[PDB]
Design an enzyme around this catalytic site. Structure first.
Site, mmCIF file in Angstrom:
data_model
loop_
_atom_site.group_PDB
_atom_site.id
_atom_site.type_symbol
_atom_site.label_atom_id
_atom_site.label_comp_id
_atom_site.label_asym_id
_atom_site.label_seq_id
_atom_site.Cartn_x
_atom_site.Cartn_y
_atom_site.Cartn_z
ATOM 1 N N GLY A 1 0.845 -1.180 0.000
ATOM 2 C CA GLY A 1 0.000 0.000 0.000
ATOM 3 C C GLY A 1 0.886 1.237 0.000
ATOM 4 O O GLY A 1 2.110 1.130 0.072
ATOM 5 N N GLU B 1 -1.421 -4.006 -5.849
ATOM 6 C CA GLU B 1 -2.624 -3.281 -6.227
ATOM 7 C C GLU B 1 -2.215 -1.882 -6.676
ATOM 8 O O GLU B 1 -2.434 -1.499 -7.826
ATOM 9 C CB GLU B 1 -3.624 -3.220 -5.070
ATOM 10 C CG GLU B 1 -4.902 -2.452 -5.393
ATOM 11 C CD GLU B 1 -5.758 -2.196 -4.169
ATOM 12 O OE1 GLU B 1 -6.119 -3.172 -3.478
ATOM 13 O OE2 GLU B 1 -6.073 -1.019 -3.896
ATOM 14 N N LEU C 1 -4.943 0.798 11.187
ATOM 15 C CA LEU C 1 -5.026 1.803 12.242
ATOM 16 C C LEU C 1 -5.142 1.155 13.623
ATOM 17 O O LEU C 1 -4.611 1.672 14.603
ATOM 18 C CB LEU C 1 -6.213 2.735 11.987
ATOM 19 C CG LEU C 1 -6.143 3.564 10.697
ATOM 20 C CD1 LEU C 1 -7.385 4.430 10.557
ATOM 21 C CD2 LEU C 1 -4.881 4.426 10.637
ATOM 22 N N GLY D 1 -9.059 -3.454 -1.357
ATOM 23 C CA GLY D 1 -8.454 -4.697 -1.792
ATOM 24 C C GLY D 1 -7.425 -5.273 -0.842
ATOM 25 O O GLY D 1 -6.719 -6.216 -1.197
ATOM 26 N N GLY E 1 2.097 5.102 1.622
ATOM 27 C CA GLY E 1 2.432 5.617 2.936
ATOM 28 C C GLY E 1 3.929 5.691 3.151
ATOM 29 O O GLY E 1 4.708 5.217 2.322
#
Length: 440
Positions: free
Chosen positions: A226, A249, A324, A347, A228
């Protein structure tokens, strides 16, 4: 075909291009940087003039582009957001709708991202699709560029396809990434830089976390990350690896760095050998430029990328996702909003499942143990309501204090080992809670 003639009989202004869009119809658009600023501004102006109504917009990942045009709160009565994934823009709209006499102003559509193409094409139905594209080549083809996702499907299945040509949009190779001009209904040109994912600075916890995660990345790992600061830092640690692959993804700056360094070769992959695979891309100018005409980067639709069976066919998949919260059962929550779950649509879970099913594969979900200057624990007793990652799917979890494989552990073994990943300040409190819940 006489493509020069076709271009000119389809080329037009943003205002005219969106003027025939019917009221009471369904519209969708490209994700993120593929949202077309000129077309969307023109459409927003239609709503402002009162020239269109009851327009449903179905979409997943939105940006300032849509946020500042068609999704402005004032147009809410005429252009209806039908969000299939809730981000900051929707958070602000929903908040404001509560203020304004408790109005529902965002219509959430629960969905699986990996089913987005089918859902939008068949269940929902899209009348108009709009997408920023790279300039037409000499063979008459545009490219979806940073997008594939649902977009490569809906560009064909939608009854009208309108494109916004931008030279700043990279020309990207991929499955159904190329669109012939004969498949396009209208064209506008607007050459402006792509919007960028804002760079966020690392927090101190990301240093320990990124090293724990790095030790969990085997030789010839096939990566998914992801966005970040944490994933980017992890890529930084993997700069001394070799023969890694990419099947992700989101393609982000961290992964592209590993390509540029020659760390990623994709030669150990079973599927798409020699090519890095993604469904859509987010980053900054430098990354977007790098994608242009890259022969070892290959976009594919989300129903391939995010299919756990497809993901699993590559050996040694490593899936690295952020969350989180983690509770003492091993369930995880990625949704910012209190009391609600709009994050399950994402996803993330697809790769949690796919990575575990991969031979040698590892799903990693990571988070710092605390928030708000150490005053709030991100390791909690229990998640409120539906979750992002169910406890039966969670594989590895990581904080700055270590890693735990939860698969096969009892409720008690889970709670005892998860607590040791919490910050020292909270471990006693979590232990009492675990007893009250009768986990230990």
């Amino acid at each position: 075909m006489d493509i020069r003639a076709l271009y000119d009989e389809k080329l037009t202004t943003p205002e005219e291009a969106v003027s025939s869009i019917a009221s009471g119809s369904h519209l969708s658009m490209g994700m993120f940087a593929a949202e077309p600023p000129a077309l969307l501004k023109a459409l927003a102006d239609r709503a402002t003039r009162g020239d269109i109504g009851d327009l449903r917009v179905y979409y997943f990942v939105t940006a300032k582009i849509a946020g500042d045009t068609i999704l402005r709160y004032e147009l809410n009565n005429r252009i209806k957001p039908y969000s299939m994934f809730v981000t900051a823009v929707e958070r602000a709209l929903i908040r404001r709708g509560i203020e304004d006499g408790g109005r529902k102003v965002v219509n959430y559509v629960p969905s699986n991202f990996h089913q987005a193409p089918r859902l939008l094409a068949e269940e929902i139905g899209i009348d108009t699709f709009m997408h920023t594209v790279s300039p037409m080549d000499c063979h008459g083809y545009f490219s979806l560029g940073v997008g594939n996702d649902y977009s490569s499907r809906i560009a064909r299945s939608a009854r009208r396809f309108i494109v916004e040509v931008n030279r700043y949009m990279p020309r990207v190779q991929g499955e159904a990434a190329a669109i012939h001009i004969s498949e396009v209904d209208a064209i506008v040109e607007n050459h402006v830089p792509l919007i960028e994912m804002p760079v966020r600075s690392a927090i101190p916890e990301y240093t320990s976390i990124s090293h724990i995660i790095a030790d969990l990345v085997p030789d010839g790992a096939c990566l998914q990350m992801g966005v970040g600061a944490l994933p980017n830092l992890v890529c930084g640690v993997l700069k001394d690896r070799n023969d890694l692959g990419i099947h992700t993804e989101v393609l982000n700056p961290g992964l592209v760095d590993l390509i540029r360094r020659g760390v990623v070769t994709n030669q150990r992959k079973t599927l798409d050998r020699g090519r890095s695979v993604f469904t859509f891309a987010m980053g900054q100018q430098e990354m977007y430029e790098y994608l242009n005409d890259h022969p070892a980067i290959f976009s594919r639709p989300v129903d391939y990328v995010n299919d756990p069976h497809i993901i699993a066919q590559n050996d040694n998949v490593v899936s690295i996702n952020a969350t989180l919260q983690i509770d003492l059962t091993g369930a995880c929550n990625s949704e910012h909003m209190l009391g609600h779950q709009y994050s399950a649509s994402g996803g993330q879970l697809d790769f949690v499942r796919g990575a575990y099913a991969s031979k040698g594969g590892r799903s990693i979900i990571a988070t710092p143990s605390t928030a708000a200057k150490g005053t709030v624990s991100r390791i909690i007793p229990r998640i409120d309501g539906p979750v992002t990652t169910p406890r039966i799917d969670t594989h590895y979890i990581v904080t700055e204090f270590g890693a735990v494989n939860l698969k096969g552990l009892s409720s008690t073994e889970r709670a005892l080992r998860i607590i040791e990943l919490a910050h020292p300040d909270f471990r006693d409190e979590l232990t009492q809670a675990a007893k009250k819940m009768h986990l230990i």
